Design a protein around this ligand. Structure first.
Ligand code: PLP
Ligand code: PLP
Ligand code: PLP
Ligand code: PLP
Lengths: 456, 456, 456, 456
C-alpha cells in the first residue's frame, strides 16, 4: 500500500493547547522569529528533530519500571548487550549516553594526528570529533548525492573511485577509517545499498582500512534496501540489518534515532584491543562500561526499542509517512530535496522564496512563517546555521538553504502530515507575501540557537 | 473543517502483531465465529466498545504515579470531588468503581416498589437496577428516535407529551424519577438538546418530580449542542456541560466513557439526605465513601480526564472521527443507522445481508466476516444479543439487527478508520458471500458472551 | 530469626510532611478528635487498614504499563485466570473490583432465604451480604477464640462439634454453605490449621455441604501453618496454599489484602452451574466476566502480586513485623489482644484507660492521643463504631473496646514500628492523662466516619 | 534522636531472590572473587556505590510521566533551571548527563596549560579533566584529613595557610581555580564548614581567583553544618545550601548523588562569557544546552529530587543511617575510617586482615568474604583499584587499603544495616580465616573492573 495505516494503537497522548493564529504570531515575535527559541508548550507539531522525540511503546514503558540501577552487573545492561550483539553482530558494546558520546570515544581511539577520515558526507558532531582528534575529513559520496533535484535510489552510496583516489594520493596507512553513514543525513536521509557496503568493505579490506558505521538511521536504511534493492524484497529487516553491519568493523549508534528512545547510544567494535581501550576511556567521559552514562531503565528501553524497530510494518509505515508528506508537497510544486529520505523532508527555501535574497534569510523566514500559519516547528538549516565567517565577517553562503521537516517516530499521524503540508502549500501559493528577516540580536557563536530577528 | 487532525500527539503506542488473513480465519474459527470470544492480542482495531478502552494522557499517567492509597482522606478523592463539583455543579459525590455501581446506589435510594421511571430509551444495567428495586420503566423518547433512517438532529429528545401523559395517568407521586440519558445509546448515540433538558426540567419542577441523568456520554452530548443548537456556537463545552446538569437533581456517571479513563464512575446528587443514605449504602457494595471501589490513582486519573474532556478541539475531533467513518460508509452505499452518534457507527446487517434471514444471525456473521477480512472487532447488536423468549422458546426478533463499530477515545487515527471502512466496503461489494450461522453451543443466559456457531 | 530484615529493597518512596506536634494537635482538633477525619497528607504512619494500602513491586508496576484494556479477551485476564488456577486450584474465576463484590455474587448465588451460613466468626461486609440474601449466620468457631487474653494457636479453627450439632439439628440440606475465613479478622487475624480445613472438608463431604473460603488473608494463614503446624515446616508456602484450597469448593478473595495490590478481588468456584450463574450476575454489579470491574492493568498487578506473596521470606517478614510490634508492646505491659494476628495489633483501650468509662469513648480518645503524639493513625473499634441502638437510642456496649493498629504490606519498617510502639508506651506510662471524649457532632448514619468530639 | 525512623513510606519495592550461602559462594567464584563482576540480581544489599542507586519518590515518578522530550524549549528544562537557580543561587545552568560531563566542560573552559587547580583532596574524574586540560593539581586540605583514625569535625576543610602559600609561590594568575569539594570523598565523605567556605572565598576574592565547587554531596555537607557548626543549629538546610554556594563562582553537580536521581548532572556558573562558551562546548559532548544529554523526564526528576533533598528529616535520616552502621561496627571493634562521613563507611582491610600482606589483596578478599557471608556487595578501594605503576610495573601500596560500604539514598533500612554490620562483625571474630588472593587474569587497563582472582 502507498500509505499504510499505523501498525500500532495509541496507548497514551500528549495534550496540546490549540492556540490561535494571533497567539502564535505573538509567540513567534516573542521568540524573535527564531523557531529554536519557541517553547515546546506553544507548539502543536514539533518537527525540529527526529532525535530523542520518539514515542515509546507500552512494552518499553514496562521496561522503564524495572530499571536495575546497579553500577555494574545490571540486568538492563545484559539485555542491551545481548540484543545489540544479536541484531548488529558486533562482538562488543560500550553504552554511551547518546551518539556523540560514542563518536567522542571512537575518534579518540581510532585517529592519529595527520590522518584522514573518508565518509559519505558528514554530520556536525561526527565531523567535530574526527577533526578534534586530528583527522581531515574527505567526502567520498557519489557526485549525485549533491544534486538535490535528482530522483535516484541509494543516493548515499560511496563512489569507489573517490576512495581509490584518496588511497592512491594519501596512502592507506594515513586513512584512520572510512566513516560510512546510514542513512546520509546531509543529502536528506538518503540510503546506502548493500552492494555499496559490500564493495566498500572489499576495497577497504584489500588495503587494511577500518570501516566504522555512523549507524543512527540504519533501520530506515534497511527498509530502503528491502523496498528497492533487487533480491532483498523477501529478506527480513532483521537479516538486512545484520548483513549491513557484517561489512563494518564497528559503529557509533544513537538510540535517539532508530532505537525508538528518548536518550541512549552505544559504540560497537569486534576486537579486544579497541574494546579494552574504549572501556578505559568511557569511564572519564560517560561512566563505567556497565552503564555508559545511562540509567538502567534506559538501557532496557533502548534494548526493547531496537528490537521493535525490526518489525517490517513499523519501519515501512515510518518511511511511508515521511514519503506521504513529500508526495503532498511535490504534488503542489513545492521545492523539496529528492527523493524523500527516511526521516525528514527538506524544503528548498531559496526556491520557495525567490523574492528574498540569501542575506534576508529565506530558510529562517520560511520556518517562522510555517509556525505562524500552523503551529508546526521546523528547523532552519541554511545561511543562519552556516554562521558568519570569522575571517571576513561575511555570512557563509551554503549551497543548501533548507528548512527541515524532521519527523519523530510514532508521534504523529497522516492528519498531522496534512496540517504540515496544507500550511506549507498555502504559503507556497502566496510565497511573494512571505517577509524576509534581518538580525536584531546575533551572538558570536551558535547563532542559530539564540539569534533574534525582525521582518523586512 | 469536516475532519480536523488529532489535537494531541502520540506519547506512547500499544504494540500490535500484524497477523495475516489465514491466522485471523483460524482465530475466528477457534472463537466459534463469535467476536466476543476473540483474544485481544489477535485484534488490530478493537471496536467492540468505547467503554474503558480510552487512551489516557501523559498528565493522567503522572496522576497514576501519585495515588494516595489511604482508606480515608486521600488527596485523590479531594481532587475528584473538587473537579466534579466545579464541572457538573452538584453538591455531593460518591465515587463508584464504574457507572453500574452508581446505578445500583441510585435505584436503591430513589425507587420504591410500584413506582415508574420514565426515560429516553434505556440501557441494560440502568434498567436492570431500576426494575430490580421495583420500578416499571416507561419510554418517553420521541417516536421518531426509533426510525434508524431519519437524519434528524437531537434524536435523543424526550417527547414532553408522553411525559405529560404519564404524569396525568399515573400521578407525579408515583414517578420515582425521570432518567434522562445523554447521549441516547439505543438510538445510536443520539444527543439531547439543551432546550429539551430545560423543558423537561420545567415540567418536572411543576410536579416536584426528580430528574437524574445517565450521563456517561455527556461531553459528546455537549459537543452536539455546541455544533448544532442555536445559541451555543460560541459557548464553551465546559459551560454547556454546566448548564446541562443545572436541569438535574443528580447523575450516574461512567468515567469509562467521557472521563477518558479505563475504570471509574460516580454518583452525584444535591440532596443532603440522599447523600448520607448513599454513603451508608456504598460501604457494602463498593467501599467507603472516600474511595468507592477505586484506587486513589484512579480517582486522580478520572479527575484529570474529565477536565481534559472539556477541551473543545478534543471532543470535536472525537465526534468528527466517528462521523468520518460513517461518511465513508455512506458514500459507498453501506447501510448504517442515521445520523451518526457520538461514539459509534451501526451497520444495518439486515440490508447488508439481504440473502440471510434474521434467524441465520446476519449481524453475528457480518461481525465475524469483518474480523476475518480486516482484523477489526465489532459487536453484534441483534438477534443473538436479544436472547430467546422464556415462554415461547423462540428467539426475539429485534427491529435493529446491527453490528456496532464502537470507537474508543484517543486510540485510533483516520487511517485506522480507513482500514475499517475500506474493509467493510469491500465486503459489501460481495455481500452475498457472507454465510449464515447456526448455534453449536448456546448458554442459557448471556448467550452473546460465549455462544459458538458454525456456518449453515 | 525473630525479626528478619526486609527481603526486598525500596524502589520508590512516598514523601511525608514531618509536621510538628503542635501542628498535629491542630489537625487532630480540626478532625474533632476522630482519626477517620484526618487527611492522608497529615499522617506519617497510617495504620487505619491493611486493605488496599500495600506497596507494589517494580514488577507489578511494569505490569501496570501493559494493561490490555479490551472489554473481552484481555491478556491480563488470561494471566490472572492462569495464575489463580495454578496457585489456588479452582476450576473457574470471576474477577470483581474487590472482595465485597465477590461476596455479593456468592451470597446471591449460594443462599436461599431462611437458610444458615456457618462460619468461624464474621466480618462486616461478608455477614451483610449473607443476611441481605436471607441467611442466618451461625458462629461455629471454638469458644476459646472469643477469649481475647488467651494465647491459643490456630484460634481461627472451626469447632467440628458445633458444625456436627448444626448438621444434626437443622439438616445438611438447610446449610447453604460453610464460610471458612483465613485468617479470622474479628479475633485479631488468627489462623486456621490445615488439619481443621481437612476435618471440615471430610465432614461436609459426607453430608454434601458446600465450603467456600473467605480467603482475603490466605497467605498469612499459610505462613502460620508452615511455622506452627506439625509436618509443614519444610512444605513451601505455595504447596500449603494449594492444599488449603483443595478442601474448599470455591472462595471469595480481596486482592487488596494478600495479593499485594491497591484494588482487585475475585470469586473462584469448581462447579460449572455456579460459574454460569456467577457470570450472569457479575454483569449487572461489576462488569463483564472478562474484567469484573477492574482495569486490565489491575488484573495484571493482582496476578503478579499473588505470585509474589508466595515467597516464603516475604510472608515470614510480613507476619514477623506485625509480631515485633506486638512483642514490643507486650514487653512494656501494654494491654493487647493475644496472640498477635497476621496483619494487626489490637490495643485494649478499656484496660489502657481504666479511669474512663466506655461512654467516655476510651478507644476513640486513645486513637486521637496516638496520632497527636506520633503522627500514627489507628482505628477506633469500640463503642463509637458499634453505633447507637436501633430501638432504644442507647449506645451499644461492645465487649471489645479496642484501637486497631493495622499494618499494610511492604510499606513500613521496624523503625516505623518503633515510632508506633514508643509513642504508645509513653502514653501508657501516663495513661491517666488521656481525657474522655463526648460527642459534639453525631450523624445518624456511619457515625464512626464523621462524628466529632471534644474532651470532657 | 540518635537513629530516627525513615521520614517517608515505601511506595514500591524491588524484590530480592534470597539465595543461600552455598549459592553465593558459587556466584563469587564465578565472578573470580571480584565483587565488580557479580550480577545485580544475585545481590541482596548492593553497597558498591551511592551514585545513581537512589530511590526516587512518587512525585519524581509522576514527573517521569510528563517528560517533554522537545529538543529545545522543554518545560522540564525550565523547571530544572528555575529550581537550581532558586536553591543554588547561580545565574546560569548547563545540564549534563552526569557530573563528569560537567567536569569536562568546566576544565576545558577554565584551565590554561600549566595553571594550577587547588583542591581539598581529589576525585578521579574531576582530577582527570583538570590534568587533561593542562593543570597541575595541588592538595590544600588540612593535614589532619589524611589521619584516618582522627575523630575531628569538618575534616574536609581547606588549610588556609596552604592556600596562601600556593598563591604566594605560584601567583594568583597561575591558579585556574580552587576546586572545593563538598563533602570530601577521599577522606571518607568528610564535610567542609561554612566558616571555611567563607574564608576561602574571601582570600580568593582578594586575588581574583575563581572558585568552583565539586558539589555532588553538598546536601550531606549542609546537614553536618546544621548539626555541628556553631550558629547553624536553627538554620534550614535550604538556607545552608544557598549560603554554601554563595561562596563559589559555579559548580559541577552530580544529580546521581544528592539530587536523589539515577542519572543527571549540571554545570552552574555566574559569568556570562563562560556560560556562552559552555553552551558552545556542551553541544558536541553532551547535547544542546536545552537538554545536555538528558531526557526531559530526567531534567524533571532531578529538579524534583533536589527540592526533596532540602527536607531536614530526609537528610538527617540519610546521614544518621550511615552513622548507625559505623556505630555498630565501632562498638564491636571493627576498624573503620573515622569519623563516619555522609554516604559511606570504609573498613580498614589492613587491620581487618593482619595475617595478609597488601600484595595478597586484603580489601579485595574482604569484599568477597562479605558477599559470601551476607549477600552484601561492597567496593575494593585499595591496592587493586590503585593500579600498577606506570614506570616500574610494580603495584602501588596505598596507605588506605579499604572496603567501601556505600549507602544509596532511601533504598535500605536499619534492618539492612544490621545484616551488613552483623555479618562483618561475625567475619571479624574469625578474621584469620579470610584467604589471600592472587591474580589469575589482570587486564592492563581498568583492572579493578574485570580482574579475576583465586585464593592463595
Ligand atoms: C543524530 C546524529 C548523530 C549524533 O547522535 P546523537 O545521539 O544526537 O548524539 C550522529 N550522526 C548522525 C548522522 C546523526 O543524525
Ligand atoms: C456504559 C453505560 C452505562 C454503564 O456504565 P459502566 O461504567 O459500563 O458500568 C450506563 N448507561 C449507559 C448509556 C452506558 O453507555
Ligand atoms: C477486607 C475483608 C473483606 C472485604 O474485602 P474488600 O476487598 O475490602 O471488599 C472480607 N472479609 C475479610 C475477612 C476482610 O478482611
Ligand atoms: C560522583 C563524583 C563525581 C562524578 O560525578 P558523576 O555523576 O558520577 O559523573 C565527582 N566528584 C565526586 C566527589 C564524586 O563523588
Amino acid at each position: 500500500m502507498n500509505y499504510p495505516a499505523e501498525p500500532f494503537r495509541i496507548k497514551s497522548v500528549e495534550t496540546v493547547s490549540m492556540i490561535s493564529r494571533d497567539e502564535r504570531v505573538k509567540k513567534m515575535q516573542e521568540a524573535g522569529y527564531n523557531t529554536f527559541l519557541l517553547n515546546s508548550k506553544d507548539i502543536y507539531i514539533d518537527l525540529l528533530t527526529d532525535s530523542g522525540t520518539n514515542a515509546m511503546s507500552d512494552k518499553q514503558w514496562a521496561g522503564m519500571m524495572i530499571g536495575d540501577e546497579a553500577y555494574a552487573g545490571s540486568e538492563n545492561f545484559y539485555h542491551l548487550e545481548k540484543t545489540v550483539k544479536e541484531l548488529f553482530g558486533f562482538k562488543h558494546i560500550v553504552p554511551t549516553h547518546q551518539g556523540r558520546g560514542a563518536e567522542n570515544l571512537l575518534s579518540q581511539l581510532a585517529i592519529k594526528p595527520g590522518q584522514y577520515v573518508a565518509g559519505n558526507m558528514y554530520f556536525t558532531t561526527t565531523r567535530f570529533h574526527q577533526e578534534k582528534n586530528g583527522a581531515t575529513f574527505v567526502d567520498i559520496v557519489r557526485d549525485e548525492a549533491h544534486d538535490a533535484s535528482l530522483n535516484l535510489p541509494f543516493k548515499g552510496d560511496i563512489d569507489l573511485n573517490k576512495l581509490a583516489t584518496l588511497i592512491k594520493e594519501k596512502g592507506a596507512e594515513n586513512i584512520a577509517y572510512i566513516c560510512l553513514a546510514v542513512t546520509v543525513n546531509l543529502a536528506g536521509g538518503q540510503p546506502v545499498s548493500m552492494a555499496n557496503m559490500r564493495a566498500v568493505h572489499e576495497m577497504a579490506s584489500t588495503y587494511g582500512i577500518k570501516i566504522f558505521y555512523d549507524a543512527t538511521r540504519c533501520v530506515e536504511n534497511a527498509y530502503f534496501i528491502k523496498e528497492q534493492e533487487a533480491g532483498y524484497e523477501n529478506v527480513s529487516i532483521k537479516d538486512i540489518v545484520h548483513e549491513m553491519f557484517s561489512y563494518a568493523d564497528g559503529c557509533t549508534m544513537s538510540g535517539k534515532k532508530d532505537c525508538l528512545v528518548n536518550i541512549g547510544g552505544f559504540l560497537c567494535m569486534n576486537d579486544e584491543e579497541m574494546f579494552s581501550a574504549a572501556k578505559e576511556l568511557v569511564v572519564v567521559y560517560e561512566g563505567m562500561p556497565s552503564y555508559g552514562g545511562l540509567a538502567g531503565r534506559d538501557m532496557e528501553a533502548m534494548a526493547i526499542g531496537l528490537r521493535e524497530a525490526m518489525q517490517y510494518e513499523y519501519i515501512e509505515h515510518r518511511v511511508k509517512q515521511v514519503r506521504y508528506l513529500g508526495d503532498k508537497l511535490r504534488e503542489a510544486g513545492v521545492p523539496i530535496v529528492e527523493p524523500t529520505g527516511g526521516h525528514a523532508v527538506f524544503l528548498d527555501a531559496r526556491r520557495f522564496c525567490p523574492h528574498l535574497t540569501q542575506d534576508q534569510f529565506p530558510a529562517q523566514s520560511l520556518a517562522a512563517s510555517i509556525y505562524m500559519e500552523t503551529g508546526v516547528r521546523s528547523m532552519e538549516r541554511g545561511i543562519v546555521s552556516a554562521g558568519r565567517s570569522k575571517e571576513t565577517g561575511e555570512n557563509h553562503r551554503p549551497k543548501l538553504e533548507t528548512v527541515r521537516l524532521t519527523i519523530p517516530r510514532r508521534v504523529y499521524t497522516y492528519a498531522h502530515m496534512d496540517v504540515v503540508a496544507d500550511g506549507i502549500i498555502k504559503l507556497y501559493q502566496h510565497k511573494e507575501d512571505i517577509r524576509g528577516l534581518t538580525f536584531v540580536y546575533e551572538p558570536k557563536q551558535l547563532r542559530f540557537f539564540t539569534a533574534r530577528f525582525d521582518f523586512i
